[PDB]
Green fluorescent protein (Aequorea victoria), 220 residues
Amino acid sequence: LFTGVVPILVELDGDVNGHKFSVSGEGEGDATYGKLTLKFICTTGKLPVPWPTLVTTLVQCFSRYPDHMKQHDFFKSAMPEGYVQERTIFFKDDGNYKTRAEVKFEGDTLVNRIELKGIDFKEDGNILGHKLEYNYNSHNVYIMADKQKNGIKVNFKIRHNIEDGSVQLADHYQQNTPIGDGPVLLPDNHYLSTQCALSKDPNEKRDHMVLLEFVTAAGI
């Protein structure tokens, strides 16, 4: 399923502090390189929150798992039936996002369909006030087997640099559970070294985000 380039489609319906928006993304992924290339468009106009705050929500099955760690790749093992991915994201001293996504193959395309709900954000906070830098730091995504639910428990803290020079933390709590009933690979503890680079197409006038992502599994 992931031997070569795979087309990707991402759909997100969001509601933050009552502000409703929709984001659509398209591109491709190459697990062999652990690379993702995607463009996202806010199809409802201006995005009410900073693009960087939606990166983690907007397909870890594209991570490059070295061959000696392939028995720890839950993400691809759950395919093509896919997995449900849910998170709660708390922005320090501000609101939180609650998301529920379904990641699976629809025809030849890997599709990530998400629903996001944001509550308790400060009107003039770093989020609703768009005070975050348009960039992204590298982070380690810690994965643990969740034997019980035959899935995984994932945790990590995102560091969003603020335009004033400070840092806006976003604690992520995520759970992944297979959509299929068959067995999947339950990994030993490990992490995904994840890198993201954000850019803009100067010719594009719609509110958008061009994203390049590099991810390699490690820890074993």
Q: What stands out?
A: Residues 110 and 177 are 17 Å apart (CA to CA). The helical segments are 74-77.
